[PDB]
Structure 1
């Protein structure tokens, strides 16, 4: 309810705890694709001079 304060000041804290975990996880997992891509591009950024 809406005069109900303790249901609200519970739920937005369970939401805030999940949100603090969520950007840690999803920023680290996006940083997994980007780390393979930069590593692929940096070993390629060795190979073309081994070639040239």
Structure 2
């Protein structure tokens, strides 16, 4: 029991770290794209 109730607790700490990191890193591409698209959404007004 003390092996099993360690291994899944160390797995659980790592999973709470994992989604924090990866959901902020994928939001970095999504934040680049939406700022990239919104500055293009200025440039097209200036053009037209």
Higher relative contact order (CA 8 A, sep 6+): 1
TM-score normalised by structure 1 residue count? 0.92
Mind listing any 5+ residue stretches in structure 1 that lack a counterpart? none
Mind listing any 5+ residue stretches in structure 2 that lack a counterpart? none
Instruction: Give the Cα–Cα distance (whole angstroms) in 1 for the partners of residues 17 and 10 of structure 2.
Output: 11
Bigger radius of gyration among the two = 1
Q: How many residues align?
A: 48
Superimposed CA distance per residue, residues 3-42 of structure 1 (whole angstroms, 9 cap, x where no aligned partner): xx00000000000000000000000000000000000000
Instruction: Give the Cα–Cα distance (whole angstroms) in 1 for the partners of residues 31 and 16 of structure 2.
Output: 23
TM-score normalised by structure 2 residue count? 0.99
